[PDB]
Every structure is written in C-alpha cells, then in structure tokens.
Write a protein that binds this ligand. Structure first.
Ligand code: CLA
Ligand code: CLA
Ligand code: CLA
Ligand code: CLA
Ligand SMILES: C=Cc1c(C)c2cc3nc(c4c5[nH]c(cc6nc(cc1[nH]2)C(C)=C6CC)c(C)c5C(=O)[C@@H]4C(=O)OC)[C@@H](CCC(=O)OC/C=C(\C)CCC[C@H](C)CCC[C@H](C)CCCC(C)C)[C@@H]3C
Ligand SMILES: CC(C)=CCC/C(C)=C/CC/C(C)=C/CC/C(C)=C/CC/C(C)=C/CC/C(C)=C\CC/C(C)=C/CC/C(C)=C/CC/C(C)=C/CC1=CC(=O)C(C)=C(C)C1=O
Ligand SMILES: CCCCCCCCCCCCCCCCCC(=O)OC[C@H](CO[C@@H]1O[C@H](CO)[C@H](O)[C@H](O)[C@H]1O)OC(=O)CCCCCCCCCCCCCCCCC
Ligand SMILES: CCCCCCCCCCCCCCCCCC(=O)OC[C@H](CO[C@@H]1O[C@H](CO)[C@H](O)[C@H](O)[C@H]1O)OC(=O)CCCCCCCCCCCCCCCCC
Ligand SMILES: CCCCCCCCCCCCCCCC(=O)OC[C@H](CO[C@@H]1O[C@H](CS(=O)(=O)O)[C@@H](O)[C@H](O)[C@H]1O)OC(=O)CCCCCCCCCCCCCCC
Ligand code: HEC
Ligand SMILES: CC1=C(/C=C/C(C)=C/C=C/C(C)=C/C=C/C=C(C)/C=C/C=C(C)/C=C/C2=C(C)CCCC2(C)C)C(C)(C)CCC1
Ligand code: OEX
Ligand SMILES: [Cl-]
Ligand SMILES: [Cl-]
Lengths: 137, 36, 334, 51, 244, 30, 32, 97, 33
C-alpha cells in the first residue's frame, strides 16, 4: 500500500466538490496537528470530552457538518457546539480566540486546511484506530 | 491517645539524646589504633 | 570512672556478642517496634481500605489468608501522605481500618535499617577495618526506600507503596508495568544485568575456587576440613584457577589478582542495583520507560506492530483492570 | 418461664451423659440450641394429664 | 466569626455544622402570602446505632452503639430546597440539591463492620398544620430515599456486577451455578428512611434555626448479597431560611 | 487449623535463629 | 476456609521426617 | 426469582432505541442536532409517558420541535430503571473511550 | 465410614514421636563403643 491521490482526495465542501492533496500537505498538516491540537485530540479522540471524536462520521453529523475542509477550517475560526447553537471559542482554540490560545496566533489559512485534510485523510488510513481510543492501540 | 503521644515523644527524645551525646563523647578516639 | 563513660564504653564495646554502638541505640528499638507490629498484623489485622473507596482488603491469616496471599496492607488513599500515628486516630479500630500499622511498620523499619547501615560502618571503625561494607548494603537499602518512601511521595500516597506481602508484591510489580513500562526502562535493564550477572559471577567464583582446592583430605571426608580457621595460608591454587579459566576463554579475560577479582564481585551487583533503585525512584516522578507504540509505519501510514506494541496490549489489560472501582475519570494520572 | 431456666432442665447438659471418646463441645453432639419449643403436655383420650 | 479555609483546614471543623447562641430562642414568622427556601441545611451525626439480630427465641432486639471508623467524613450539608406553606398552614420542605449523602462505616462489638449510606436524598419534611411562625417547639417529620450503597457500575472482587462485570463465578468453571445465584446476580435496592427534626434554637433576625434530628434507615446490603441492618442516626442540624 | 500450622512453623524458625546465634559451634583458631 | 484436609498431615510429616533424620545423625556424632 | 435488571432492559426497546427515560445523554450524539442543547432538555425533564410528550417541553423553538419530530422514530420510552438513572449515571455512566 | 479426621494425624503422631525418641537414643548409644 502507499499514500496516493485517491487517498489524499477529501471533500472540499458539502457540494461534493473535492480537492486532492500532496504528500507535502498531508505531512504538513500532521506536523501542525501535533503542534496545535494533539495535546487534546491524539489519535482522533478528545481527552477533555471523550464523547466527541474526529471520526469523519461524527464530523458528518455535526451542525454545520464538518466532514469536509471548509466546515473544518470554519470550526478552527469560529468553533461551535455539536449542534451549532453555541460558540465556544472562549474555551476551544480558534483564530477568533488566538489572544488566549497563543499557538493559533501564527497559523495561516494555508495551515488550517493542511490540518483539516490531515484530519479527513487519517481515518482513510487507520480506519477504526482513528477516534477509537485504547481498544485499538 | 494524648498519654500515648506524650510517652512516645519522651521515649523518642531520650533515645535521640543518647545518640547525639554518644557521638559527641570523643567517638573518634574509640578505635583499636591511634587515639588521635 | 563516671556513669556516662562506663555506659559509653559498654555501648561501643567490641566484646558484646552482638555489637550495639550509637547507631545500634536507635536501630534496636525501631526494628523491635516494626517487627512486633508486623507479626501481629500479618496474623490478626482486620481488613484495610487501601484505595480509599471503602472496599477493605483482607491481608491477615485469621481473615482467610495464607502465607502467600497475606500481607500488611498499605494505608488508605484518603490519607495520601498525611502522618497517621496511632494518636491521630479516634480509636485503634479506626486506625486498623485505615491502615495505620503499615505506616508504623515502614517508618520504624526504614529508620532502623538506615542505622543498620551506620552500624556496619561503626563496628568496622572499632575493629580497624576498611569502612566500605556499608556502601554495599546501601544498594538494598536504597531499593527499599524506593518502594516504601520515594514512590509514594511522587505519586502522592502511601496507598501506592509496596505492600508487605508475597502476593501484594506481585500486585505492585504488575501495576508498575502498566503505568510506567518498567521493562522498557534502561535502569531496570541495568538491574537485571545487575542480579543475573551477580548470580553468574557468584556461581563462577565459587565454582572456580572449589575447582582449585588443594588436596588436604581423603575421599571419605568432606573437602571442607582441608581448611582450618584463621590458618595463615591459602586453600586453593589461584594460579591454577587462572590457568583453567584463562583457557576457557582467553588469558586476559581472566583475573589473576585476588584483589581486583573481589572488587569486581562487589561492584557489579551493587551498581546495577543502584541503577534499578534509581530507576524506581525516578519513575516515582513519571519519567517512564521507552515508548515505541506505533513507531513503525508503512508507505501509506498503516501501523506495523512490533513486539513493543504487543507489550502495550499487555500493559493495557493491566491498566484497565487495576483498582477497578477507583477511577471516575478517563486518565490515571497518579 | 425464662428459657435459660428451662435449658437447665434438660439431660443434654447433664455432665454424666457423655462418653470418653466423644470429643469436642456439647454443641457437636445435640447441636446448637436456638429456641425453647415450649413445655409439652400429654393427655390421653379421657383428658388425664400424662407424664 | 468570619473564619477562613486556612483557619479551618485539618482541624475537623469542616465536618461540623454552624451553631446558634444559647440565647437564640426567638421565632421566625411565616407570611403565608410568601414563598421560602432553605438556603443551606446541614446535618451532622453524633451517634450511629444498629439494631442487633435477636436469636430465634428472641424477646427483643435493641439498638446497640457502634464505633465510627471512617473519620470526620459523615456530615450532610449545602442542602437546598423550597419551604412551601401548605393550606392547613403546615410547612413542607422539598429538597432539590445538596451534598445529601455520606457513606459511613461503623463497627459493632465483636468486629462486624456495617456500611450505610447516610442520606436524606429527596427528603420531604412537613410541620404540623397551622404554623404561623417557627419556634423552639417546631418539628418536621419526613421521608427520604436510600439508594443502593454501591451503584450499578461497582464490581466485586471476582469481577461481578450489575451494569458491568462477569455474570458468573469464572474461577469455578463447572460448579453448580445454583447455590451461587445470590452472589452472581447483583440487585440494586432503593428503600425509604424517616427523619424527625426538632427545632430548639431560633434566631428570627437572621432566619437561622438549629436543633436535633434523628433518622432511621437501612444499611448496605451489598447489591443483594446479604440482608441489611436497621440503623438509627442521631445528630444536630442547622438551617438558614431565606425569602424566595 | 491452617493458621496454627503457619504460625507454629514460623515460631520454630525464630527458635532456630536463637540457637544458631547463641549456641553455635564457637569458631576457634588452629 | 475450605482447605485440603490432608494438608495438615502432609505439612506435618514434611517437617517431622527429615528433621528426625538430621537430629538422629547429629546426636550420634556428638557421642563419639 | 433473581434477575439482572439491566440485562432484561436490553431485550426491551432500550436495546434498540434511545430510551428518553433511561439512556445516558451521550447516546444523543448519534443523531443530528440533538446534542447537547436538547439532550439536556430531554433529560432534565426526562420522565415521560409517551415519546411525543417531548414536543411539549417548555421553551422549544419551532426548529427544535421539528428536529424532535424528525427523530421521534429513534426514541422510545420504558419504565424508569432505578439502577440506570441513580448516581447521576444518565449524565456520566463511567464510559469514556 | 464417617470417621474422625484428626484420627489420622493423631495416630501418626502417637506412633512417630515416641518412636523417633527411642531411635535417637539407641543410635547414639551404638556410636559410643
Ligand atoms: C529509638 C527509638 C524510637 C524512634 C526513633 C521512633 C520513631 C518513631 N516512632 Mg516509635 N516507638 C519507640 C521507639 C522509637 N520510635 C518505642 C520504644 C515505642 C513503644 C513505646 C514506640 C511506639 C510508637 C508508636 C505507637 C508510634 C510510634 C511512631 C513513631 C514515629 C513518630 C514518633 C513521633 O511523633 O516523634 C515525635 C518526636 C519528637 C517531636 C521528639 C523530637 C526530638 C527533639 C530533640 C525533642 C523535642 C522535645 C519533646 C517534644 C518533649 C516531649 C514532651 C512534650 C510533648 C510535653 C517515628 C517513626 C508513630 C508512628 O509510626 O506513626 C506513623 C506511632 O504511631 N512509635
Ligand atoms: C537465550 C538466552 C539469553 C540471552 C543471551 C539473553 C541476553 C540478555 N538479556 Mg535476557 N533473558 C533470557 C534469555 C536470554 N537473555 C530469558 C530466558 C529470560 C527470562 C524469560 C530473560 C530475561 C531478561 C530480562 C527481564 C532482561 C534481560 C536482559 C538481557 C541482557 C543482559 C543479560 C545479562 O546481564 O546477563 C548477565 C550476563 C553477564 C553479566 C555476562 C555478559 C553477557 C553478554 C551479553 C555477552 C556479550 C557478548 C560479547 C560482546 C560478544 C563476544 C565477545 C568476544 C568477541 C570477546 C542481554 C541481552 C535485560 C535487558 O533486556 O537488557 C536489554 C533485561 O531487562 N533478560
Ligand atoms: C527475569 C525477569 C526479571 C528479573 C530478573 C528482574 C530483576 C529485578 N527486578 Mg523486575 N520485573 C519483572 C521481571 C524481572 N525483574 C517484570 C516482568 C515486571 C513487571 C511485572 C517487573 C517489575 C519490577 C518492579 C516494579 C520492581 C522490579 C525490581 C527488580 C529488582 C528486584 C531486586 C531488588 O530490588 O533487590 C534490591 C534489594 C532489596 C529490595 C532488599 C532490601 C533488603 C532490606 C534492607 C532488608 C530486609 C530485611 C528483612 C526484612 C529481614 C531479614 C532478617 C532475617 C534474616 C530474619 C531486580 C533487578 C524492583 C527494583 O528495581 O527495586 C528497586 C522493583 O521495584 N521489577
Ligand atoms: C486438664 C486438662 C484439660 C482439660 C480437662 C481439657 C478440657 C477440654 N478441652 Mg482442652 N487441652 C488441654 C488440656 C485440657 N483440656 C491441653 C494440654 C491442650 C493442648 C494439647 C488442649 C487443647 C485443646 C483443643 C485444641 C481443644 C480442647 C478442647 C477441650 C474440650 C473437649 C476435649 C475433648 O473432647 O477431650 C477428648 C478427650 C479424650 C478423647 C481422652 C483422651 C485420653 C487418652 C486416650 C489418654 C492416653 C492413654 C495412654 C497413652 C495410655 C498408656 C499408659 C500406659 C502404657 C503406661 C474440654 C472442655 C476442645 C474444645 O472443645 O475446644 C473448644 C478442642 O478443640 N483442648
Ligand atoms: C529481595 C532481596 C533481598 C533481601 C530480602 C535481602 C535481605 C538482606 N540483605 C542483607 C544484607 C545485604 N544484602 C546485600 C546485597 C544485596 N542484597 C540483595 C537483595 C536482598 N537482600 C541484592 C540483590 C544484593 C546485591 C546488591 C549486602 C551487601 C548486604 C549486607 O551487608 C546485609 C547483611 O547483613 O548481610 C548479611 C540483610 C539485612 C539485614 C537487616 O537489615 O537487618 C535489620 C532488620 C532486621 C534484622 C529485622 C527486620 C524486620 C522487619 C521490621 C520486618 C517487617 C517489615 C518487612 C520489610 C516486611 C517485608 C515483607 C516482604 C514479603 C515484602 C538481609 C538478610
Ligand atoms: C566447520 C568448522 C569451522 C569447524 C572447524 C572448527 C575449528 C577447529 C575452529 C577454528 C577456530 C575458530 C574460532 C573458528 C572461527 C569461529 C569463531 C569465531 C567462533 C565464535 C564463538 C563465539 C561467538 C563465542 C563468543 C565468546 C563469548 C562466549 C563471550 C566472551 C566474553 C567474555 C570475555 C566473557 C567473560 C567475562 C568475564 C571475564 C567474566 C569473569 C567472571 C568471573 C567474575 C569469574 C570469576 C573468577 C575469575 C578468575 O579469573 C579467577 C582466577 C577466579 C578464582 C574466579 O573466581
Ligand atoms: C507432642 C506432640 C505429640 C503429641 C500428639 C499425640 C497425639 C495424642 C493424641 C491424643 C489425643 C486424641 C484425640 C483424638 C480425638 C480428636 O480428634 O480430638 C480433637 C479434640 C477436639 O475435638 C474436635 O473439636 C472440634 C471443635 O473444636 C470438633 O468437635 C471436631 O469434630 C472434634 O474432633 O481435641 C482435644 O480434645 C485435645 C485435648 C484433649 C485433652 C483433655 C483431656 C484430658 C483428659 C485427661 C486424660 C489423661 C489420661 C492419662 C492416662 C494415663
Ligand atoms: C512418607 C513421608 C511423607 C512425606 C511428606 C508427605 C507430604 C509430601 C507431599 C505430598 C504431596 C502433596 C499433596 C498434598 C496433599 C494432597 O491432597 O494429596 C492427596 C493426593 C490424592 O488426592 C486426594 O485424592 C482423593 C481421592 O483419591 C480425593 O480426591 C482428595 O480430595 C485428594 O486430596 O495425593 C496424591 O495425589 C498422591 C501423591 C503422589 C503424587 C505423585 C505425582 C507427582 C509426581 C511428581 C513428582 C515431581 C517432584 C519434583 C521434585 C523436585
Ligand atoms: C569518549 C567518551 C568519554 C570517555 C568516557 C570514559 C569513561 C570510562 C571511565 C573509566 C573508569 C576507570 C576504570 C575503573 C577504575 C578501576 O580500574 O578500578 C580499580 C581496579 C584496578 O585494576 C587493576 O589495576 C591494578 C593496578 S592499579 O591499581 O590500576 O594501579 C592491577 O594491580 C590489577 O591487576 C588490575 O586489575 O579495577 C579492577 O580491578 C578490574 C575490573 C574493573 C571493573 C570496572 C569497575 C566497575 C565495574 C562496575 C560495572 C557496573 C555494571 C553494571 C551491571 C548492571
Ligand atoms: C483541549 C484543550 C483541546 C484542544 C487543544 C483542541 N481541542 Fe478540539 N475539541 C476540544 C473539545 C472539548 C471539543 C468538544 C467541543 C464541544 O462541542 O464541547 C473539541 C472539539 C473539536 C472538534 C469537533 C469534532 C466533532 O466531533 O464535532 C473539532 C473538529 C476539533 N475539536 C478540532 C480541533 C483542532 C483542529 C485543534 C487544533 C488546531 C483542536 N481541536 C484543539 C478540545 C480541544
Ligand atoms: C533501653 C536501651 C536499649 C534497649 C531498648 C529496647 C530493648 C527497646 C524495646 C522496644 C520495643 C520492644 C518496642 C516495642 C514496640 C512495639 C510496638 C510499637 C507495637 C505496636 C503494636 C500494635 C499497635 C499492634 C496493634 C494491633 C494489630 C496490628 C492487629 C491486631 C490488634 C492490635 C490492636 C493489637 C538499648 C540496648 C538499645 C541501649 C540503650 C538503652
Ligand atoms: O491506587 Mn494504587 O494505583 Ca498509581 O495510578 Mn492511579 O493510583 Mn491507583 O491508579 Mn493506577
Ligand atoms: Cl489492582
Ligand atoms: Cl479518578
């Protein structure tokens, strides 16, 4: 098996447009995810609220949906609750709240998509492991 | 308990003074060779 | 002369069957207290709520244990690191429940064993000896401080010290592996080399001295009577043992200096054991063993398990089952 | 009638009903006493009290 | 006075309810057009008594004294709820929330340990009718729930439980399951308790009261595995009433 | 009965310590 | 505790028999 | 005479659907728009006679009543099981990942 | 038969202990001459 463009092709928006990624961008978005997010989201779980993971299926049923890049990039600017009714940038890192979450201050728009595509790619690779927790380690 | 506490404190103290004063009593001279 | 001096001379007397000394003045009463409390608790102590969850663990023979399952049980997690003398309890009944005998025993013992060490120095000074035996004993002593003192400190509770029991000791080892991966720690690898290598060199030194005993007896008597005590001369030909072992391997892998040979035998296990006790003492602060879980992956990103990944599945089963009613939240942070 | 008194009035607690190699406590033999059943009264068909 | 955490810590006083002066024997008027609440209710046990198992002959079982072995961990406090005025004039308190349970272990002569969930959960305590003011002769009587001492996830030493765990005795693979059922099958009990609160000190200025309480409830039965004991708990209580 | 057996053997060993120390063959110097 | 009842006799003879062997051999050394 | 009440419950509709009177609040993540806002409301008002009494919860917005309608087929109600709802277990049942 | 289980430990000790005693004294009697 290898890292291919069909692997690296993830939903861009909910209109079913897609985008294909490079080796460089997936690895780029792995590094940034490690840097900025994995302290809480290692392997697709959420340590501080294990009821919400980054499985693409969970991301799908979010309001708004987040199983695409634009939805994810938006969440990283203006995060909401699962159901969409509450902005939570006061506690969840985001560009909006980069004055209290410093690690976000220097993230470019090209960076947030790198991370989103990583998130959307990684479960194509690992399947159940991603978002599964220790049962699958 | 109070009684027990006081008795343990005194016991511990007595034993600790024996120890300090024993090594202060020219412990370096006590040996089978040169008495400094 | 005067009283204080007649007593000082009795204390430091080299004619007592057992040396007392000033270290011995602290050692004796504290070992006596530890030993008497331990014998009574092992036999008769009622159950002890070790994990602070009102789930008492029976450790004593009269409450259904045998020699292998019994133990004096660590004090409760609700105590954590607080001092808990008998006088701090409202009743012996409370004290027994919350695990007080464990605190009484390990402090009197740690204290009395540290003075054992000083006593070894003290009698060597009265005897005109070189002083460093006590240095060797410091390797076991240090190991005991680790499981009974240092590890509770780093983890915030004497409830996580080693139990005073055969099975309780295994309990402590298994939970240590899940929470720290001690098998993957180099200091414990240094400890195994410590004691395998010690036993090796023990079997070797004995086997090679016994091989080179000088015919002093006939075939019907123990060879052992070929040695008499305090005899001026040696009872084995070291030149002969070097010639045998120097050829078993090669000539310079073999010791021919008696002094170099014994210092080697002292230093190997002492150092190794220093390292494994240093290793328990630094895992007390959660600086844990090597972690190579999901360290090998293929072109696409699939995890190619190694033996380290199999170890982690074991570790994980210990992790999720230990202290099964004691965790309310998803991480076990101490 | 206090039970303790009626329990004395029972040959099972008579010390001269034992046996040399019948070992252990009295409870190993007739068992552990639990309750008094009451004082038993026998009458024939005529209604005479019988002993 | 206005003491602080650092004044109190380690002293045993965190397990004590507040008290009112020998001289607070006044009375707090109840404006029936008005609404009320207990802003803080505190219950502090001072003695635990267990009913003894009278033998088959029996005659009578008494409540025997017991030794507390779990330290100053026993009090119920920060309890809140609304004090309604009923139509016959009585006052009824309805608990909402609060630290309204403490697990407790006491020990009977001979060495038997008796755990119990000392609780007033869902308490509902009422006064006699036509109470226009609360006084140093006012009483409430009430009932509460006592849930199982362990809850559904609790596993036993062989790994058995209700919402989780082994459902059999796995160390005895081919034993007859039949005599093991009461220990294989975890049951979750919910029983009722009873409590009387006797107001004996009132401070009508501040709205505080203080008195004694005595409750009766069952001890832990260990998810069905043995029979519980009857337990009687006595202690003191303190309350603060505010206009709602 | 089993507790009694464990404690009896333990007790015998303590007795053996006592004799082995205080009633040892006294070593001497030929 | 439902322990094995031959355990007592097994422990007892496990102690007694080899201990008698040693005592027999020590005492008859001391008397020659 | 002696049964595991939780095991019995898995043979009821609790075992197929979200039991509005019993199920832990994390099960509402399964469907779009219920979590967390309405999950809290469902549970806080929990004990219901029929699944549809849930449309009568005070304060529902009109989008809320419509989401619930969309997800009435995924709900059921059974008798409250004491072991399932005590201990605040509906809010946290000891299960994480 | 439903027999006394200490009967066995009892008989064994009854036999062994006096016997070992007699043997110990006999063998050290022979070791003299
Ligand atoms: C060499 C003797 C010795 C030593 C060093 C210890 C040491 C200890 N014992 Mg042991 N103990 C001993 C002999 C000894 N014991 C004997 C012989 C008995 C049987 C009677 C006991 C019975 C015993 C019990 C029953 C308990 C201990 C406990 C302790 C611990 C704390 C004792 C304490 O509070 O010290 C406090 C001591 C001091 C503050 C004195 C310090 C020395 C200064 C220089 C003097 C200060 C003046 C002093 C306050 C004046 C005393 C009177 C005043 C209060 C009115 C400590 C590990 C307790 C324990 O293990 O808790 C976990 C415990 O519960 N011990
Ligand atoms: C098949 C045989 C075998 C061999 C060769 C080893 C070898 C080793 N194991 Mg291992 N072990 C074995 C079986 C074996 N084990 C078994 C059956 C068990 C139980 C299941 C264990 C359990 C075990 C544990 C728990 C640990 C080890 C560790 C070690 C290391 C230290 C060994 C040591 O200090 O011994 C003492 C021996 C000496 C002091 C003599 C020196 C021996 C060395 C290795 C020879 C050097 C080779 C030489 C340079 C080449 C030729 C020289 C010539 C050119 C002059 C070493 C790699 C430790 C480890 O993993 O460290 C990585 C450790 O943590 N072992
Ligand atoms: C082949 C496999 C193997 C081997 C060889 C070892 C070897 C070792 N392990 Mg490891 N271990 C293993 C597998 C193995 N382990 C596995 C699989 C696990 C995971 C489950 C662990 C988990 C583990 C832990 C968690 C610990 C070890 C420790 C140790 C060391 C124990 C010896 C020690 O501390 O001596 C040191 C000497 C002493 C402890 C003795 C103190 C003596 C006192 C001072 C005197 C007591 C006197 C007594 C009370 C009275 C006697 C009087 C009498 C005459 C009447 C040693 C290097 C321990 C260690 O490193 O300790 C620091 C430790 O804590 N191991
Ligand atoms: C005066 C001494 C005395 C007395 C009166 C008792 C009395 C009692 N004991 Mg106690 N006991 C004693 C000494 C005594 N004990 C001693 C020394 C010990 C330690 C060995 C014990 C250990 C002990 C235990 C462990 C138990 C008792 C129990 C009992 C009770 C019932 C015992 C029973 O069934 O006997 C049975 C008696 C016999 C079958 C008679 C045996 C006589 C033999 C046959 C004589 C031997 C003959 C000889 C070899 C012939 C050769 C002679 C010729 C060649 C020269 C009873 C209250 C029991 C009880 O109920 O406790 C709650 C129990 O379990 N005792
Ligand atoms: C588990 C392994 C282990 C044990 C048990 C052990 C034991 C001992 N080693 C001693 C010595 C030594 N061991 C040495 C090197 C080593 N020792 C090693 C490993 C061990 N050594 C290793 C691997 C090495 C090589 C580095 C040296 C160099 C020495 C000595 O010099 C010394 C000695 O004298 O050798 C003859 C003795 C210390 C006597 C003493 O302190 O009396 C004081 C205390 C007494 C007498 C009574 C204590 C009773 C207490 C209160 C009992 C209750 C509390 C216990 C801790 C309960 C524990 C329960 C267990 C089941 C865990 C003792 C026999
Ligand atoms: C088909 C064919 C090829 C057949 C032809 C066969 C043929 C004739 C062979 C040709 C020769 C040849 C070698 C061919 C090539 C093959 C070859 C290279 C073989 C490889 C063999 C092999 C890998 C062996 C590895 C070596 C190994 C075992 C380790 C050595 C390491 C080593 C030095 C360890 C010992 C360490 C050490 C010194 C321990 C001390 C222990 C100790 C404390 C001792 C105590 C002690 C010591 C004393 O000292 C004295 C005094 C006394 C008192 C005493 O107590
Ligand atoms: C030294 C060690 C070697 C000595 C051991 C020698 C064995 C001797 C055996 C003698 C005992 C025989 C006991 C067999 C029955 C047994 O099982 O009972 C064991 C009985 C107890 O009995 C057990 O008790 C249990 C509940 O405790 C249950 O009842 C059990 O069923 C019952 O077996 O133990 C005793 O009776 C032991 C001591 C008895 C001594 C008191 C009587 C003395 C009377 C005076 C006799 C002197 C006569 C002098 C003659 C000259
Ligand atoms: C004569 C001197 C006496 C010596 C001391 C005697 C004790 C010695 C140890 C006894 C064996 C331990 C058994 C415990 C008692 C027990 O219940 O036994 C009792 C058991 C018999 O089992 C009994 O059986 C009964 C029905 O027959 C019932 O089932 C009882 O429940 C059951 O206890 O005894 C044995 O099984 C016989 C022992 C022979 C075993 C031989 C096979 C093992 C060979 C391996 C040898 C390797 C040794 C390696 C050495 C290194
Ligand atoms: C580039 C990286 C940076 C570099 C880093 C360098 C670090 C290396 C440090 C060098 C250390 C110096 C050597 C040690 C001191 C010394 O030689 O000892 C003194 C003697 C002197 O040797 C004896 O020497 C004698 C003469 S004399 O005393 O030297 O003068 C002679 O009489 C005798 O025959 C002979 O055996 O040495 C020995 O007797 C020989 C064996 C030496 C064994 C090593 C010592 C310690 C072993 C512990 C190992 C722990 C393993 C843990 C296991 C789990
Ligand atoms: C801990 C401090 C966190 C860090 C660092 C990051 N996130 Fe997070 N994340 C956290 C929580 C508590 C939650 C739940 C929010 C809620 O609704 O209460 C989340 C959630 C997300 C989601 C939503 C996933 C879903 O299932 O709907 C996403 C997509 C997400 N987080 C992404 C994310 C990224 C990319 C981060 C790095 C830039 C990151 N999070 C940091 C906690 C924490
Ligand atoms: C004087 C002197 C000396 C000596 C000393 C001594 C000898 C001491 C002793 C001491 C001791 C001798 C001590 C003791 C102690 C003890 C203890 C401290 C114990 C405790 C115990 C306990 C507390 C227990 C309890 C219990 C249990 C555990 C269980 C069951 C129940 C009961 C409760 C009983 C010398 C020579 C040095 C010199 C100097 C002088
Ligand atoms: O107690 Mn004893 O053990 Ca060290 O981690 Mn946390 O805590 Mn408990 O758990 Mn895992
Ligand atoms: Cl555990
Ligand atoms: Cl926790």
């Amino acid at each position: 098996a290898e890292l291919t463009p069909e692997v690296l092709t993830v939903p861009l928006n909910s209109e079913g447009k897609t985008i294909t990624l490079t080796e460089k961008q997936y690895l780029e978005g792995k590094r940034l995810f490690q840097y900025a997010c994995a302290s809480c989201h290692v392997g697709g779980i959420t340590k501080t609220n294990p009821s919400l993971d980054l499985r693409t299926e969970t991301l799908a049923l979010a309001t708004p949906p987040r199983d695409n890049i634009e939805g994810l990039v938006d969440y990283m600017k203006n995060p909401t609750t699962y159901d969409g009714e509450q902005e939570i940038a006061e506690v969840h890192p985001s560009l909006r709240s980069a004055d209290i979450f410093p690690k976000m201050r220097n993230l470019t728009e090209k960076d947030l998509v790198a991370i989103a595509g990583h998130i959307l790619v990684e479960p194509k690779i690992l399947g159940d492991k991603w978002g599964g927790g220790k049962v699958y380690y | 308990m109070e009684t027990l506490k006081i008795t343990v404190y005194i016991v511990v103290t007595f034993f600790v003074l024996l120890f300090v004063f024993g090594f202060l009593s020219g412990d370096p001279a006590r040996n089978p060779k040169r008495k400094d | 002369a005067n009283l204080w001096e007649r007593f000082c001379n009795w204390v430091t007397s080299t004619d007592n069957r057992l040396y007392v000394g000033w270290f011995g003045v602290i050692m004796i009463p504290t070992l006596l207290a530890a030993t008497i409390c331990f014998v009574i608790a092992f036999i008769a102590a009622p159950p002890v709520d070790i994990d602070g969850i009102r789930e008492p663990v029976s450790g004593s023979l009269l409450y259904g244990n045998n020699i292998i399952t019994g133990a004096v049980v660590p004090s409760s997690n609700a105590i954590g690191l607080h001092f808990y003398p008998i006088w701090e309890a409202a009743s012996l009944d409370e004290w027994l429940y919350n695990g007080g005998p464990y605190q009484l025993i390990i402090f009197h013992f740690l204290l009395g064993a540290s003075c054992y060490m000083g006593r070894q120095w003290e009698l060597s000074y009265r005897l005109g000896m070189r002083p460093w035996i006590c240095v060797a004993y410091s390797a076991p002593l240090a190991s005991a401080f680790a499981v009974f003192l240092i590890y509770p400190i780093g983890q915030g509770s004497f409830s996580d010290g080693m139990p005073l029991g055969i099975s309780g000791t295994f309990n402590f080892m298994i939970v240590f592996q899940a929470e720290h991966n001690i098998l993957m720690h180099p200091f414990h690898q240094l400890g195994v080399a410590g004691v395998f290598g010690g036993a090796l060199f023990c079997a070797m030194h004995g086997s090679l001295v016994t091989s080179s005993l000088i015919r002093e007896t006939t075939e019907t008597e123990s060879a052992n009577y070929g040695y008499k005590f305090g005899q001026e001369e040696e009872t084995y030909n070291i030149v002969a043992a070097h010639g045998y072992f120097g050829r078993l391997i090669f000539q310079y892998a073999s010791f021919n200096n008696s002094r170099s040979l014994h210092f080697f035998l002292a230093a190997w296990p002492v150092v190794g054991v220093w390292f494994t006790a240093l290793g328990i003492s630094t895992m007390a602060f959660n600086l844990n063993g090597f972690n190579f879980n999901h360290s090998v992956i293929d072109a696409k990103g699939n995890v190619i398990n190694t033996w380290a990944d199999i170890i982690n599945r074991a570790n994980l089963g210990m992790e999720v089952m230990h202290e099964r009613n004691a965790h309310n939240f998803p991480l076990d942070l101490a | 009638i206090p039970e303790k008194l009626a329990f004395y009035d029972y040959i099972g607690n008579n010390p001269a009903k034992g046996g040399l190699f019948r070992t252990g406590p009295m409870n190993k033999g007739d068992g552990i006493a639990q309750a008094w059943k009451g004082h038993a009264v026998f009458r024939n068909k005529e209604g005479e009290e019988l002993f | 006075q206005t003491l602080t955490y650092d004044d109190i810590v380690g002293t045993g006083l965190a397990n004590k309810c507040p008290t009112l002066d020998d001289t607070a024997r006044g009375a707090y008027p109840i404006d029936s057009s008005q609404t009320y609440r207990i802003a803080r209710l505190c219950l502090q046990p001072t003695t635990f008594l267990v009913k003894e198992e009278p033998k088959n002959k029996r005659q009578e079982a008494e409540f025997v004294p017991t030794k507390l072995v779990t330290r100053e961990t026993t009090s119920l406090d920060q309890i809140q709820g609304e004090l309604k005025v009923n139509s016959d004039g009585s006052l009824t308190f309805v608990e909402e929330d609060g630290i309204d349970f403490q697990p407790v272990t006491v020990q009977m002569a001979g060495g038997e340990r008796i755990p119990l969930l000392f609780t007033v959960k869902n308490l509902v305590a009422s006064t006699q009718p036509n109470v226009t003011s609360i006084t140093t002769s006012t009483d409430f009587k009430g009932e509460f729930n006592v849930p199982s001492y362990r809850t559904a996830n609790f596993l036993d030493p062989k790994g058995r439980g209700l919402a989780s765990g082994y459902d059999s005795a796995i160390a005895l693979p081919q034993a007859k399951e039949e005599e093991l059922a009461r220990a294989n099958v975890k049951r979750f009990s919910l029983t009722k308790g009873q409590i009387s609160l006797n107001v004996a000190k009132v401070d009508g200025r501040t709205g505080e009261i203080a008195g004694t309480f005595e409750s009766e409830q069952l001890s832990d039965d260990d998810m069905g595995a043995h029979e519980p004991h009857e337990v009687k708990i006595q202690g003191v209580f303190y309350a603060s009433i505010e206009p709602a | 009965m089993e507790t009694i057996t464990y404690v009896f053997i333990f007790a015998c060993i303590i007795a053996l310590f006592f004799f082995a120390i205080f009633f040892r063959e006294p070593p001497r110097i030929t | 505790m439902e322990v094995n009842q031959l355990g007592l006799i097994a422990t007892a003879l496990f102690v007694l028999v080899p201990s008698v062997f040693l005592i027999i051999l020590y005492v008859q050394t001391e008397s020659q | 005479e002696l049964v595991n009440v939780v095991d019995e419950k898995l043979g009821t509709a609790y075992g197929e659907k979200i039991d509005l009177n019993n199920t832990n609040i994390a099960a509402f993540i399964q469907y779009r728009g219920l979590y967390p806002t309405l999950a809290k409301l469902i549970v806080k008002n929990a004990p219901y006679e029929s699944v549809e009494d849930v449309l009568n919860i005070p304060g529902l917005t009109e989008r809320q009543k419509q989401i619930l309608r969309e997800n009435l087929e995924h709900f059921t109600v059974t008798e409250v099981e004491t072991a399932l709802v005590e201990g605040g277990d509906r809010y946290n049942n000891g299960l994480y990942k």
